[PDB]
Amino acid sequence: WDLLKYDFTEERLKLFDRYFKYWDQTYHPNCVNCLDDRCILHCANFNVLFSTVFPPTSFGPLVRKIFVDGVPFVVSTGYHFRELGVVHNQDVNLHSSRLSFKELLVYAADPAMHAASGNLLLDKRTTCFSVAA
Amino acid sequence: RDAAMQRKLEKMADQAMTQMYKQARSEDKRAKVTSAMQTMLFTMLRKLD
Amino acid sequence: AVGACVLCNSQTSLRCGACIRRPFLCCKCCYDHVISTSHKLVLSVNPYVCNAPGCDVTDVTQLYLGGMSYYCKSHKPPISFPLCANGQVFGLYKNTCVGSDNVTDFNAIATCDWTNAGDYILANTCTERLKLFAAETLKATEETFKLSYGIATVREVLSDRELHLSWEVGKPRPPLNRNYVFTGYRVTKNSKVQIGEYTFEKGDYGDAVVYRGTTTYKLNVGDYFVLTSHTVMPLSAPTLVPQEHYVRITGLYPTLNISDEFSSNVANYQKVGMQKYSTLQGPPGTGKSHFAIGLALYYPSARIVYTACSHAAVDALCEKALKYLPIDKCSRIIPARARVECFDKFKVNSTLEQYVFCTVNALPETTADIVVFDEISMATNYDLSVVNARLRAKHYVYIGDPAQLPAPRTLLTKGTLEPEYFNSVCRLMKTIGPDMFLGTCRRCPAEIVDTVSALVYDNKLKAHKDKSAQCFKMFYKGVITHDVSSAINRPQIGVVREFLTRNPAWRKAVFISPYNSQNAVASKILGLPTQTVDSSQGSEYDYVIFTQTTETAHSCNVNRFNVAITRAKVGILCIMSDRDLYDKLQFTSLEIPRRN
Numbered sequence: 167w168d169l170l171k172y173d174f175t176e177e178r179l180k181l182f183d184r185y186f187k188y189w190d191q192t193y194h195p196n197c198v199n200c201l202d203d204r205c206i207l208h209c210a211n212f213n214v215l216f217s218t219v220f221p222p223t224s225f226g227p228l229v230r231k232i233f234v235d236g237v238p239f240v241v242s243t244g245y246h247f248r249e250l251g252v253v254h255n256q257d258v259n260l261h262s263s264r265l266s267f268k269e270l271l272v273y274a275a276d277p278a279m280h281a282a283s284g285n286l287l288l289d290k291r292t293t294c295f296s297v298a299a
Numbered sequence: 300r301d302a303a304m305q306r307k308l309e310k311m312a313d314q315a316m317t318q319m320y321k322q323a324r325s326e327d328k329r330a331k332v333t334s335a336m337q338t339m340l341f342t343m344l345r346k347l348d
Numbered sequence: 349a350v351g352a353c354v355l356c357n358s359q360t361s362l363r364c365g366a367c368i369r370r371p372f373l374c375c376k377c378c379y380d381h382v383i384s385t386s387h388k389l390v391l392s393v394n395p396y397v398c399n400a401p402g403c404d405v406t407d408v409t410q411l412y413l414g415g416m417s418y419y420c421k422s423h424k425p426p427i428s429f430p431l432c433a434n435g436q437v438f439g440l441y442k443n444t445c446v447g448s449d450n451v452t453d454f455n456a457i458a459t460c461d462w463t464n465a466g467d468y469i470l471a472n473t474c475t476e477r478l479k480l481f482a483a484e485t486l487k488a489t490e491e492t493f494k495l496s497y498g499i500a501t502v503r504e505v506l507s508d509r510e511l512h513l514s515w516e517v518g519k520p521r522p523p524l525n526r527n528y529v530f531t532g533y534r535v536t537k538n539s540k541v542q543i544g545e546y547t548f549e550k551g552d553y554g555d556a557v558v559y560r561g562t563t564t565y566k567l568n569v570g571d572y573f574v575l576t577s578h579t580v581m582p583l584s585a586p587t588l589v590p591q592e593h594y595v596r597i598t599g600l601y602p603t604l605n606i607s608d609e610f611s612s613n614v615a616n617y618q619k620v621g622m623q624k625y626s627t628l629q630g631p632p633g634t635g636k637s638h639f640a641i642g643l644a645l646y647y648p649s650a651r652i653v654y655t656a657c658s659h660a661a662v663d664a665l666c667e668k669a670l671k672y673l674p675i676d677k678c679s680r681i682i683p684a685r686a687r688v689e690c691f692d693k694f695k696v697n698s699t700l701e702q703y704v705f706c707t708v709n710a711l712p713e714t715t716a717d718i719v720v721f722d723e724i725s726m727a728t729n730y731d732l733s734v735v736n737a738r739l740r741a742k743h744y745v746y747i748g749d750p751a752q753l754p755a756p757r758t759l760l761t762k763g764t765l766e767p768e769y770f771n772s773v774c775r776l777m778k779t780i781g782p783d784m785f786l787g788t789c790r791r792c793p794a795e796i797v798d799t800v801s802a803l804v805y806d807n808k809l810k811a812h813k814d815k816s817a818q819c820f821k822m823f824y825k826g827v828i829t830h831d832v833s834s835a836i837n838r839p840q841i842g843v844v845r846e847f848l849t850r851n852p853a854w855r856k857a858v859f860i861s862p863y864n865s866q867n868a869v870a871s872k873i874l875g876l877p878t879q880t881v882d883s884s885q886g887s888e889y890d891y892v893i894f895t896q897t898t899e900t901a902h903s904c905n906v907n908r909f910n911v912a913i914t915r916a917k918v919g920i921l922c923i924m925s926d927r928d929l930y931d932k933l934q935f936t937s938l939e940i941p942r943r944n
């Protein structure tokens with residue numbers, strides 16, 4: 167798999183058809199479209215199953231390059247859950263002027279900048295997925 | 300009354316004054332942490348592009 | 349939000365919010381501000397309002413300090429005292445607050461409207477903090493006035509240079525001027541994007557006008573045009589540094605002798621090395637920007653800043669400057685916005701070179717040894733204060749001549765500004781003189797330098813080449829045949845119907861005239877381009893046909909007449925019912941019905 171691909175929706179639908187054809191209830195690969203909470207559980211279960219196939223680097227925050235007062239940033243605009251598929255933020259604005267306290271907080275708290283401005287790391291003391299030092 | 304009610308005037312003036320001093324301190328440290336956050340963001344950004 | 353009183357400078361956190369800019373007043377000062385004028389709204393770090401719901405009473409004089417908040421007379425707690433008492437409003441630092449009685453000029457500036465001359469008169473002759481406050485208030489007021497304007501939708505984009513722009517409905521259209529720069533807005537449907545900044549100009553006719561833009565991103569028919577804006581920023585640096593004379597060169601390391609043509613200027617460079625700051629008067633065409641480049645070469649081991657106001661001004665400073673000077677240069681002013689193409693030489697942001705040609709409004713954080721400022725006929729106290737706030741050099745020199753035209757200042761409708769009350773630099777350079785005069789002019793003809801010396805000047809500047817063909821054919825002005833409220837002196841042009849053939853070597857002459865309408869109506873039936881002196885402060889012309897207008901003082905201004913003659917090389921003519929102006933100007937007087 168290429169490093170940049172992160173959608174992975176039709177693959178889930180095709181696996182669902184290949185292995186569970188005659189299951190008699192709808193299945194939304196992206197739980198954003200679910201109805202009530204019971205459909206959320208029903209679809210998150212299959213997502214838990216299928217997400218053990220795809221590469222592990224393609225999970226976590228989705229970042230993108232935004233500008234404020236002529237300065238390029240790197241902030242996150244969504245996620246890619248192992249259970250709830252892909253989620254996109256609704257209120258995102260490129261080209262800003264100034265940031266007030268609220269936005270300063272939500273930008274300083276993201277791991278996007280911290281990880282994008284750090285050295286790669288390969289920790290062999292563990293087996294969990296490392297990210298950056 | 301002129302011996303006690305004015306002491307109540309004094310206590311209320313003093314508590315309002317102290318509260319508004321502490322509020323001034325709140326807004327001051329507010330501006331300070333704001334400056335700190337933004338300088339940290341800028342210096343972190345200047346290492347990636 | 350604690351600060352020093354704008355009158356007595358005792359620590360305070362009091363402001364009267366009804367005043368537009370909200371300055372720091374002491375307890376006494378704020379009391380005087382609230383009992384006398386209409387600012388019946390006072391605020392400390394917390395607002396002073398009846399905190400009762402439904403009771404929105406405003407003035408503090410009808411408030412009473414309650415348990416924790418301030419309440420009105422009605423919803424008052426039984427145990428409460430007022431907030432206006434013994435001449436001090438209830439706030440911080442009650443006992444160390446000193447106040448004074450200078451509340452007079454304070455109310456004068458806090459209650460003025462800037463629509464008259466006398467307001468600007470007082471704003472120029474008040475105390476330092478009062479002067480900065482007046483500057484701030486008038487800048488905020490002109491910002492709100494410009495924002496009181498509106499939009500301008502495009503009818504047709506003829507070209508990148510010719511534009512058909514109609515303005516808002518039921519709205520006073522902004523005149524064809526260079527100062528009002530227009531930002532463009534084109535909505536997808538959905539997302540209105542800023543399409544850049546654009547400048548306009550009166551065309552050769554109507555309604556298609558000439559215009560220039562910062563971008564090749566061309567316009568469209570649905571775009572709408574509004575003038576750009578911002579917010580007025582506070583200032584803390586004073587207007588002018590005090591004078592400091594020095595008995596010896598204060599670190600100023602000169603050159604040996606390199607271009608001895610600047611010997612008449614080294615006698616002034618030594619003086620600039622002898623003091624902290626000074627002023628220089630360079631008439632149009634005199635040793636102006638040559639003086640400064642000679643100062644640059646003579647002291648080549650010191651960081652120097654050059655500054656102006658307009659992009660045309662900083663470019664007229666930039667021209668001959670790249671000649672006498674190694675390059676090895678820097679003059680970086682505008683990173684993202686010059687409506688007209690500005691500097692195109694080297695980088696945007698490194699402060700690389702020791703000489704920099706910039707503008708006051710766009711000066712970055714730089715340090716130097718002197719900042720030589722031209723065009724002091726157009727700067728205000730605000731530009732002086734931001735010069736002092738942006739540059740902290742070892743020397744300063746204000747170059748310029750007050751006999752030129754002032755700032756627009758559209759709000760002035762009752763009266764006119766004398767340059768002595770234009771700004772502080774002009775006040776000093778006309779009360780004590782520029783204390784450093786440079787002579788003489790060399791470009792203009794001598795017949796418009798010695799004959800024009802008799803007017804606002806004192807017969808001290810000179811030039812050469814008196815010949816030829818400089819005659820004033822005084823026509824008797826006819827009735828005002830105006831279409832727009834601006835007068836059309838077509839009878840005055842009645843002296844020019846028989847002029848296109850009798851002038852053999854004069855076909856590329858220039859029709860100049862004060863009124864924009866008088867330039868336009870001439871441009872209808874034209875034979876040569878038109879350019880009013882407002883578009884020219886950095887332009888030279890060989891021939892010129894100055895056309896005057898009605899007997900009003902708007903036409904008989906010695907300042908504009910001066911600045912309108914000094915843009916010629918060979919000849920110029922005066923066509924005016926002049927009763928006394930031709931007595932100080934000694935050429936041959938001609939009459940219109942006679943061709944000699």
Ligand SMILES: [Zn+2]
Nearest residue numbers: 194200205209
């Ligand atoms: Zn579902």
Ligand SMILES: [Zn+2]
Nearest residue numbers: 364367381387
């Ligand atoms: Zn006020």
Ligand SMILES: [Zn+2]
Nearest residue numbers: 353374377447
């Ligand atoms: Zn005071």
Ligand SMILES: [Zn+2]
Nearest residue numbers: 398400403420
């Ligand atoms: Zn009330």
